[PDB]
Amino acid sequence: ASVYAWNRKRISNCVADYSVLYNSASFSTFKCYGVSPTKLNDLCFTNVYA
Amino acid sequence: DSFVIRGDEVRQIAPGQTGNIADYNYKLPDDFTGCVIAWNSNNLDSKVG
User: Fold this and answer.
1) Rounded CA gap, A15 and A31, in Å?
2) CA angle (A18 as vertex; B16, A30 as ends), nearest 5
3) Which of A34, B30, B34, B45 is the most exposed place for a label (fewest CB within 10 A)?
4) Residues A29/A22, Cβ–Cβ less than 8 Å
5) Is A23 on the interface with B (CB under 8 A)?
6) If contacts are CB pairs under 8 Å, which of residues 1-40 in chain B contact chain A?
7) Which helix (H) or strand (E) holds B20?
8) CA–CA dist B10, B12 (Å, integer)
9) Cβ neighbours of residue B11 under 8 Å, at least 6 residues apart?
């Protein structure tokens, strides 16, 4: 969407590998706050929202 | 130490880094002492094809 109407996807009942993502040539920038990207594969969350 | 890598992967050459170069090719220690020097060599190391 146009950014004033930004999309949200709720994430639940699932797993993922994050480690490939910050290695991927698909992305021009990757950042994190309150978590290290290196640590994401060891963690769990009540929800994520993309 | 010396090697060639793509200019994007130069950010992996630091103490305590991660990603395929830092993980599987060239690991600096977390308490490294020294200098990391890099320069664009597209005019030297690249070849047509």
Assistant:
1) 21
2) 65
3) A34
4) no
5) yes
6) 18-20
7) helix B20-24
8) 5
9) B17
Resolution limit, Å: 3.6
- Identify how the structure was determined: cryo-EM
Give residues with Cβ within 8 angstroms of A23, minimum separation 6: B19, B20
For residue B17, give the chain A residue with the closest CA: A38
Unique residue bearing structure tokens 């950010």 = B11
Q: Are A42 and A50 in contact (CB under 8 A)?
A: no
B19: nearest Cα among B6, B38, B2: B6
